[PDB]
Amino acid sequence: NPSDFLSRVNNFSIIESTLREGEQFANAFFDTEKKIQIAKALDNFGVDYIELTSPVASEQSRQDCEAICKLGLKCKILTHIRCHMDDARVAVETGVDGVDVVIGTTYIIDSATEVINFVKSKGIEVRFSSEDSFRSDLVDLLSLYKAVDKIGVNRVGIADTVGCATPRQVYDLIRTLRGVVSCDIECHFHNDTGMAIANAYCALEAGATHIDTSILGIGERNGITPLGALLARMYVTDREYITHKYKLNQLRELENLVADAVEVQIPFNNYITGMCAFTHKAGIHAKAILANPSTYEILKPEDFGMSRYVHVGSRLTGWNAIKSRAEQLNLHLQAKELTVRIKKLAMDDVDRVLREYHA
Amino acid sequence: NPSDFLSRVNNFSIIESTLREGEQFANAFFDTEKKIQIAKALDNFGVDYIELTSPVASEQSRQDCEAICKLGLKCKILTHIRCHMDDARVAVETGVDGVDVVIGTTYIIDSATEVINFVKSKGIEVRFSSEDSFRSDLVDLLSLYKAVDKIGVNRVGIADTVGCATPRQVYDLIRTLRGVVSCDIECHFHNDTGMAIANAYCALEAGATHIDTSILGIGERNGITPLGALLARMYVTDREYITHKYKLNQLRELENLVADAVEVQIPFNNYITGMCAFTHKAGIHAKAILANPSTYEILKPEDFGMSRYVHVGSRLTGWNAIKSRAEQLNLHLQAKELTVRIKKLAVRTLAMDDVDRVLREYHA
Numbered sequence A: 001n002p003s004d005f006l007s008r009v010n011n012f013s014i015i016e017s018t019l020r021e022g023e024q025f026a027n028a029f030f031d032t033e034k035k036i037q038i039a040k041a042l043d044n045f046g047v048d049y050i051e052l053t054s055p056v057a058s059e060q061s062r063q064d065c066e067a068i069c070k071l072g073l074k075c076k077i078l079t080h081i082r083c084h085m086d087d088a089r090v091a092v093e094t095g096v097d098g099v100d101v102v103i104g105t106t107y108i109i110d111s112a113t114e115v116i117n118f119v120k121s122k123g124i125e126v127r128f129s130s131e132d133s134f135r136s137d138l139v140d141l142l143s144l145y146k147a148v149d150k151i152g153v154n155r156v157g158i159a160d161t162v163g164c165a166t167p168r169q170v171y172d173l174i175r176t177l178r179g180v181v182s183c184d185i186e187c188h189f190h191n192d193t194g195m196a197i198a199n200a201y202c203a204l205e206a207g208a209t210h211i212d213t214s215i216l217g218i219g220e221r222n223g224i225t226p227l228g229a230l231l232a233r234m235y236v237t238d239r240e241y242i243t244h245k246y247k248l249n250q251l252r253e254l255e256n257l258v259a260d261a262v263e264v265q266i267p268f269n270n271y272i273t274g275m276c277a278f279t280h281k282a283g284i285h286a287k288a289i290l291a292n293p294s295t296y297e298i299l300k301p302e303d304f305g306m307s308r309y310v311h312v313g314s315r316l317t318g319w320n321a322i323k324s325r326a327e328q329l330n331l332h333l334q335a336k337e338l339t340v341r342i343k344k345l346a347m348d349d350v351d352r353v354l355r356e357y358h359a
Numbered sequence B: 001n002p003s004d005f006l007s008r009v010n011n012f013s014i015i016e017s018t019l020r021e022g023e024q025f026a027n028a029f030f031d032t033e034k035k036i037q038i039a040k041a042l043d044n045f046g047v048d049y050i051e052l053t054s055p056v057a058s059e060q061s062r063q064d065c066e067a068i069c070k071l072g073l074k075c076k077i078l079t080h081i082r083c084h085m086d087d088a089r090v091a092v093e094t095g096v097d098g099v100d101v102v103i104g105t106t107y108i109i110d111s112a113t114e115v116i117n118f119v120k121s122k123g124i125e126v127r128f129s130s131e132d133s134f135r136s137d138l139v140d141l142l143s144l145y146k147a148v149d150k151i152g153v154n155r156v157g158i159a160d161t162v163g164c165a166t167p168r169q170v171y172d173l174i175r176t177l178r179g180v181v182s183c184d185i186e187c188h189f190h191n192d193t194g195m196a197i198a199n200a201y202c203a204l205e206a207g208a209t210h211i212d213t214s215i216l217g218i219g220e221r222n223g224i225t226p227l228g229a230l231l232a233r234m235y236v237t238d239r240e241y242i243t244h245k246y247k248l249n250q251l252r253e254l255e256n257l258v259a260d261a262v263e264v265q266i267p268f269n270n271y272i273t274g275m276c277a278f279t280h281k282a283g284i285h286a287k288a289i290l291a292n293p294s295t296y297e298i299l300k301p302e303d304f305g306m307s308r309y310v311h312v313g314s315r316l317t318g319w320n321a322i323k324s325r326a327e328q329l330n331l332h333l334q335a336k337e338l339t340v341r342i343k344k345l346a347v348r349t350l351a352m353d354d355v356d357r358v359l360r361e362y363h364a
């Protein structure tokens, strides 16, 4: 199939947006110190880019943008702006590697031209994006990308800001964009209807080169493509590429860092790192399928820093529950006041209570 | 455009599988009474079918199947079996409306013929399904469905048992199957790689007629297409169809019933009913986008029994947190009992997802 030649499923970059999209999470109020811990951990994890809330947003955003650019991280630091010269002047002086010029759908082209050429004159990477791309007029959108491509820009951006796009619709649009522009393509997908990971997958199949993620998917409403969930999907597609590019065994600690800051639990069903992600039912309930449960193990626990699937025969209560999960997570334990805590206190409590501990 | 004629996005049936797939959830140990509560609530909610664990699985499974069939529910009660006569004999006597004959990939066709014709001779709906369909040889699978279609079955089934299938691969396969068989098509998608909802969507676009779900997605590993998530997606596609077919304002109670039984929290990010599903960030963080946050409201709270999006400007702590969520949920508050159990959680440091947890005991 000729179209497989364009697929970027084993050759793409993550733009990690916990410090942009994630700031829109209902309970996210990151201070400078926490953002710095997150940026460092994300860099250690191996993402190519980190995106930050516009330095125009507030005085604290300008300062944090500047501080993060002074860290000497390996990943590139990106931010975004409105299509406006004053915004651009602020962004360029902050030390960022890249600026996204964002519009929402003539006088757009001439204004965008000024902004784009200014940023390029500073030696800074420039991108041009549309907001709510899937509820915009398609021909006007494509004509705008076409013109901006001729001006010369590093990347164009597509965003399903509303969460309404479906996978085949995403594939078709990105595949057309790939034929319209000569540059890289960044994508952003909201998860309101459960499509955020699928939409990311199909975008990559269609030739997109950069995907926005967020740790635990946190963001506006129910958020965007989750970091861990994208990697699980991409890992099944190309195990060797993903296992060697990212430090997958650091994913639990990365999520725990964010979950503590935004005061949430890790959901039981959470991709890879949820309580139940690496579990099989043993016993009479397993006869709801024909093959032995261990036939169905698309994810290998050891690739993600864990030791086994847990085969559940009966309800795990007390220190039996704690011990089983602790051993699956390769925690070496301390064991005293965990079973003493759990008794004076549910299933997701097991992970809650174990959050402190490292493998 | 001609392909749109085959699409079932606004004309499909849900096969609710909380009482089959859901039993494979690591922490699910439903007794007869709990299964009966779940079956009744599912029927009231408006699903067309519920599927139960094979009555062959154990003595109690046989008994619960019988008991659920005696309830007089409106939805049809389905179960599944191995491609074996003894299984079929047991299943038919239970009172079920439908039996799924499941195989995993010439003697298949002979055995399957006997079992299919037996079930049909009892006046019971028969379906024929493959397990792990997306890791099977395509030509053999399609040839098998073709043969079973000629014998005559009510439905054929496709299952991504391993969670590896991708949306376009699903579309392509279902669309081929739709041209191979003349009967209805039931689907089943695991969520290991985050595709279970997308896969259901594309299956329906391609002509599938029946989709398995489970409440909160619960099942083997991280489970299958979640009931609420499918309905959110299908609601955006056709609001009038979904809001009138299902009792969407009952979804929280339905999930709360299962969450209590399998002892989990409702995830903060859960579709529709999660803490944060109907929230916008107000303040300087909203400038991470161009438009007012209220521009992006694909889901309308009132359709799901809720009162508004919560616009968060600052950390909602204490009674402010409780009041905000309680009013969003349309609970009419009892604030002296909810003051008496957070004083008992001083036991530990209290955090965001506990708001929904302490509010579970309350109805709209």
Ligand SMILES: [Co+2]
Pocket (backbone or CB within 6 Å): A021, A161, A188, A190, A219, A220, A224
């Ligand atoms: Co967004």
Ligand SMILES: [Co+2]
Pocket (backbone or CB within 6 Å): B021, B161, B188, B190, B219, B220, B224
């Ligand atoms: Co299954």
Ligand SMILES: [Mg+2]
Pocket (backbone or CB within 6 Å): A015, A100, A129, A157, A186, A187, A188, A212
């Ligand atoms: Mg972007």
Ligand SMILES: [Mg+2]
Pocket (backbone or CB within 6 Å): B015, B100, B129, B157, B186, B187, B188, B212
């Ligand atoms: Mg089925």
